[PDB]
Symmetry: C2
Subunit: 602 residues, 2 copies
Amino acid sequence: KGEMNLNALFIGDKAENGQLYKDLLIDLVDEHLGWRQNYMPQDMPVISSQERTSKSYEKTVNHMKDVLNEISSRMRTHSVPWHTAGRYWGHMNSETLMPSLLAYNFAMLWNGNNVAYESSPATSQMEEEVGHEFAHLMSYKNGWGHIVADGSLANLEGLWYARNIKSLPFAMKEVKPELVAGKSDWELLNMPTKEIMDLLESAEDEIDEIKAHSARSGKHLQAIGKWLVPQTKHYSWLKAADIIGIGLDQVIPVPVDHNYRMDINELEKIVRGLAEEQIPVLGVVGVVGSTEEGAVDSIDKIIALRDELMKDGIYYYVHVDAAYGGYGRAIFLDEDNNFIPYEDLQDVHEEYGVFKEKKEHISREVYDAYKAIELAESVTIDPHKMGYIPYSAGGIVIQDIRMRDVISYFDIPALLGAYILEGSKAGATAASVWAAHHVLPLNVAGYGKLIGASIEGSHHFYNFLNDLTFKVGDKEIEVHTLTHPDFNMVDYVFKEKGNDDLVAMNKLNHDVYDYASYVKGNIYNNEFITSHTDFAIPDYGNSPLKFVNSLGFSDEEWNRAGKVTVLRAAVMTPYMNDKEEFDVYAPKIQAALQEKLEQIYD
Amino acid sequence: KGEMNLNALFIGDKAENGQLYKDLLIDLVDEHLGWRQNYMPQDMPVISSQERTSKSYEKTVNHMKDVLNEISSRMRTHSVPWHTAGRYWGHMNSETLMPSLLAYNFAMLWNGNNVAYESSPATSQMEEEVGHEFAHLMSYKNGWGHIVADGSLANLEGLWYARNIKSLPFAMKEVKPELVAGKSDWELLNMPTKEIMDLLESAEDEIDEIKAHSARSGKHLQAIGKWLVPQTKHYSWLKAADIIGIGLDQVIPVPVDHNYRMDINELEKIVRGLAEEQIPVLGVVGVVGSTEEGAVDSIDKIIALRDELMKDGIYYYVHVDAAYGGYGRAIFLDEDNNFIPYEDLQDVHEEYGVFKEKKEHISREVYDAYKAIELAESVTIDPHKMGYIPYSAGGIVIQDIRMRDVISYFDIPALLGAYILEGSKAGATAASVWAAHHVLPLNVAGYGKLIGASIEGSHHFYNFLNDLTFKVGDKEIEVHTLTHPDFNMVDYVFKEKGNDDLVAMNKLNHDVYDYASYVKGNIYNNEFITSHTDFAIPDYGNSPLKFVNSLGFSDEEWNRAGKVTVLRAAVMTPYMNDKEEFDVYAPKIQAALQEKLEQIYD
Ligand SMILES: Cc1ncc(COP(=O)(O)O)c(CNN[C@@](C)(Cc2ccc(O)c(O)c2)C(=O)O)c1O
Ligand SMILES: Cc1ncc(COP(=O)(O)O)c(CNN[C@@](C)(Cc2ccc(O)c(O)c2)C(=O)O)c1O
């Protein structure tokens, strides 16, 4: 429809569109109450007119008012103001899409459970569409998807899929050896996922028994392999191994590079060596959007490697943790859902308003990674992150809908609970995601413009911080950024011009956070709020060494400190894409930081 | 505060309190927008006055209106009208508490994540209170609890707790044998949960290593035991075994009686025999509130047995699945949180308005079961069920807060995600439960009156159906109820006076449902809606035999049909507690059923 103002799809940092929200909220509530009054309209109201004027009613209503007044006080005292544009530079949390908030409230009035079509048939159809929409976002042909409570529970379901998938070859031999005839025990534990599926889908009257001898029985859980994850992974993955059964001991950290993306060379070493040891890879986890750095792993090279190892009879499952950057793929899809060629990206992004300045914003290495998500088997995608959908809304997407039969217990499912890890779920959550996917198409005409604004605002902050020098009473403090953002997270540190004590930078940056957080002061009066993370050698290795040395520290001071405290800003605000609007909040950030540093040292 | 009208704590079956809802909704939204405008009030609105009058804005707003209009159409076409009182007699779904709906919407405007205190400190304190409130509901002293996305995910976390708990004895010997010195391998796999906890809490500088050798490593998952569940259990438990690692093969169905409650004698047989086989019980699952019958298992006798077997060195973990009836315990607690003596129940329930007619409504056998929930280790409680809190809100409660350290990864937790199975969670979900727990105390002064009304309305329907005879063209059809409700679910069947074909009753009852559902007709025009369930011998055994024979069928016709189709009504409406209000909807149900049966046969 030509052009779409994102400035109307949010309530606003200063409640600029608060009447629009309130008016559409009331219009929707009024439509639900009309539905209610006109279901069995011959029935007269059970709550009488005199009951609603009684003292019993007034005392109950006044008590509700007192409880809601206490919720209001606590929420307006101890809550964080990330709705503001150029003052919040911290965690992956900004404003949520008004269409989604309006739709959750509307559907919550029906209280539908999506575990069963019978409970809410309309919210259930919406969830199936949302999964078919998640598949077409990931270019998965004949794929599927479902909303998960959170992204940690979706990462778990991924391991559930793979755990049960690698267990199927061995089980097939134990129930219908005919399917896996002439196959070495090790050729079974290195069978491609497509073949395992094609075989199972062939044995119609045997799928149940093959699955009864699968990992669902509890056997072969240590034999299916070792889960390979980036070392800078999320604890959801550690927890996933513990719960699924493989155990934390069958998790191997794959080292990351100085851009904090998995070292594909090192992955090759780990995989090839474990295969010489005849131990399989249950699977490798690729991360698009790192928890602390916004780093996009080279899914392109992870999948390229898989192909090269298949010639040597080694296959691994690939699950993409795109909890953060999954919605980010929309910046690469046209209105016909085709991946835009890179040579045309900058031109298409000017035609659609994704980016306001015609320059490179996305590296071909991140483009190539986002593209190869279609060759992976499963993806964790979190609407409650860069989908700007309200919590709790996570998501999983599978490359082949048939895969759901490896998790299946017993067309739109009539019992989604028999195709998912969780049980009872809100259909309001589905209406929230469907509304957002329908106001904002999962392409360059909708979510692309929103993610583009997040990225362009991250780049303006990056360029602002890379020239920031202060002056705190004969103490010049310079700001230094960690790496060029692969998405929209800009990490940064503060340093005294001539302090070669990393423990002193790690204390400067800890003190900047302390002031830029609830730790010190009232959060309703903080002029700049940011996030903090420690990069410790136990988990990050010497991946930050290049950075620490660039700032003038030694490899011994690094091993002495044991870590670097980095400040993190996931720029999810969609208001700082315009350099002009950023240049208003620029002096407001510098002035705030000066005072903050001036309180730290005096 | 004397007396509390529940008729003001709901929007209404005919939107009687829709202005109150809308007015408190707008008052709350207005309080949030004021908070937003007055955080950094020196900042001028980024969305300009002219932007909000532009055609770009109007076209975007009109598209949002069109999407929300499509959600409205689909939701008002294919949704179920359970808000009505005496016309919906089906699944555990009625109206949700207005205080909770108002509070979710208010807190959703802050979009707080409860996985971390830093994200929303106010919603996080509310969740800790809600868990301390769940513990005092279950009389757990020094206990704790947390909100789970759903009850299936809470049942999983229970198995996570027990799986890791039984694994601790063996692991203790492998890291600090000193703690479990002089203990047989089998005395370790039959150690009481308190001792395992007291031992682990003693080895301060070793807990991490003991846990690293626990089931979290992936070892000893088949050695920890067999999970014992009622045969009429929920598939969440089957799924839980598959995911946790023990596997579906280590799940033993314990047979139920003709009241569809676990046969404690049969449990004794299974437990004692498996102990002679030297195979441990990972744990036994007790169910308060059955999925299809509303049956309360004798936790009293399950725990009594545990004590008796401990003399023979056999201990089992007990997890209570009170997803449905957990909130039901409030009907037994005084304003000082003491369990009311049974001899006084009827008198206290008249003093508090829990029951309007002074008669027995709760059997001493259900009282005794609800009381012994305090001796169990963990309980699944679903606010999104009989807590009348909106979906998705489930819950877990642990008898000892220290138990969280067996699941712990790394005062109010500063990272609840390291004490729970899930990750990112809505703080709005917490504000919804906290609001309900604060308007309705978890005792006889709040939730007791609501659950009492649900139960008294279930009893009036039970007594109505037990004398219901029709007349469909020389075909007299009589209604027969399954069992006396243990909570608020009344199961029932329809039968032709002289049809001894159970397959014909199972078709009569299937046809009654077909008409009383979305299967046949428009659901906005259904005058009576009910639920259906098949009781098959594979899962229910000969537990329905007494019932089928009472209706005049033979033990051969039972084995021929293989099942009985039962109609189910979980009376969660709080409006039918008054016989006078029920007697209005009584003729409206009989008239509807007559027509329904008259369509089936002609
Ligand atoms: C890269 C990555 N993958 C998966 C997940 C798990 O997702 P989910 O939270 O839905 O279960 C994550 C985790 N992301 N969540 C955060 C960023 C949440 C958070 C927000 C604000 C805070 O103040 C804190 O402390 C946490 C997390 O780190 O857990 C992920 O990053
Ligand atoms: C006794 C019992 N225990 C645990 C659970 C799992 O709880 P959760 O749903 O929160 O994950 C259940 C399941 N209860 N859910 C229902 C009753 C849901 C449902 C409502 C309406 C419908 O039309 C259908 O089909 C299902 C279920 O049976 O799954 C439980 O009963």
